[PDB]
Amino acid sequence: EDHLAKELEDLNKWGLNIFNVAGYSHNRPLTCIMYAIFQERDLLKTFRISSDTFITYMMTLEDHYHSDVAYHNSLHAADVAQSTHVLLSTPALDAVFTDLEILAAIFAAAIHDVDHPGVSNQFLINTNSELALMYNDESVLENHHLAVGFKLLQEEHCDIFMNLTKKQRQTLRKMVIDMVLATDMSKHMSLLADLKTMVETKKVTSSGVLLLDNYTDRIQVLRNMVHCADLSNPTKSLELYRQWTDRIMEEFFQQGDKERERGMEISPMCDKHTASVEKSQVGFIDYIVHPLWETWADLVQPDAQDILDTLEDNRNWYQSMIPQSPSPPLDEQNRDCQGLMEKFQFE
């Protein structure tokens, strides 16, 4: 009511506590944060989007997130939108992106996990589900997210791109598809390697601002930005990071319950008690999260240094929390089950 207003003061900040805004948004945080973001950037008045169309689309979209799914619910999407919005404001990117590219980035973030069933691509592939058979086992969920994101523009009072030029809409579409498909975890290595290649040949003005003359460079940054935002959990204050960890473990273990229930024998998951939560977060940072953010900190040198420090501290905290009292860890002592990182990896 009025507590929402105070929390939305941290809008342009990394330290925004999205869990608090969830409680004061009447369990509707994505529409809430998206309305906030779009006003702070004057996007509604720029692209001729009325309150009616926007709210209606966001309400429709947010409702297509699963509220019973532990991690991949609308709050995660709210979190990714807000984080993306911060990253767009990064000094090294000031005046670089056009309004259509800004619109594309935040919108992509909003839809990037819509209609997520709380199971991995591989689970859908192993079960011979409709979605796997439609998308040819190829970025199954990420394709679906985009499909749903754009189909919902067709519902009543939902076309927020109504008043865009045929050209602008085509360009927006191309960018959005590109950014969201980039969120495929099996494409992480491929994407990081090219980002490194882009840093190795970076061009800047004397003030520090990056120079990205043509679309190919501009789109590559946005890909990695939304991808960083998606993988930003470990870079947040440990007050939030631990909540996200709790949530992802609940969803992942719930997938493990499904697999047993259905008697799947393709690479079985180790059940909740035998898993090593803390070492997994460490491996997660070491092999995936830190390499990507380190490369990002290079690109926006040195705007993301504070973010990078926070990450390193969080890594050392989870490392210190690894109990040596069962050695080796239980998941390594079972030749049948697979540990958290083992099952997730192999990308």
Does 180 bind ligand 0CP (CB under 6 A)? Our answer is no
Biggest CA–CA distance in the chain, Å, is 63
Is 145 annotated among the ligand-binding residues? no
Q: Which of 49, 248, 270, 311 binds ligand 0CP (CB under 6 A)?
A: 248
In sequence order, what are the beta bridge partners of 204? Answer: 210
Pure H helices in 127-214: 130-135, 140-151, 166-181, 188-199
State how far the Cα of 27 lies from the Cα of 20, in Å rounded to an integer: 11
Nearer Cβ to ligand 0CP, position 220 or 281?
281
244 is a site residue for ligand 0CP (CB under 6 A): yes
> What distance in Å separates the CA atoms of residue 41 and residue 49, rounded to the nearest whole number?
13
Beta-carbon contacts of residue 15 (< 8 Å; ≥ 6 apart): 236, 237
The residues near 75 (Cβ < 8 Å, ≥ 6 apart) are 18, 19, 22, 29, 30
Instruction: Determine the Cα–Cα distance for residues 339 and 29; give it in Å rounded to an integer.
Output: 33
322 binds ligand 0CP (CB under 6 A): no
Structure tokens at 241: 């990071």
76 assigned binding-site residue: yes
Let me know the angle formed at the C-alpha of 313 by 232 and 296, rounded to the nearest 5 degrees.
Answer: 40
Q: Is 233 in the site for ligand 0CP (CB under 6 A)?
A: yes
Question: Contacts with ligand 0CP: how many residues (CB under 6 A)?
Answer: 11
160 binds ligand 0CP (CB under 6 A): no
Nearer to ligand 0CP, 185 or 191 (CB): 185
The only residue of 232, 235, 281, 310 in contact with ligand 0CP, by rule CB under 6 A? 281
The Cα 37–Cα 79 span in angstroms is 12
Q: Which is nearer to ligand 0CP, 72 or 85 (CB)?
A: 72
Tell me: does residue 282 bind ligand 0CP (CB under 6 A).
no
Q: Which of the residues 64, 72, 85, 290 is marked catalytic?
A: 72
Active site (annotated) includes residue 72? yes
Residue closer to ligand 0CP, measured from CB, 162 or 322: 322
Give residues 283-312 in contact with ligand 0CP (rule: CB under 6 A).
Answer: 284
Token reading at 167: 């050209």
Annotated binding residues for 3',5'-cyclic AMP, as ranges? 72, 281, 284
Active site members: 72
Annotated binding residues for Mn(2+), as ranges? 113
Residue ranges binding ligand 0CP (CB under 6 A): 185, 233, 244-245, 248, 280-281, 284, 340-341, 344
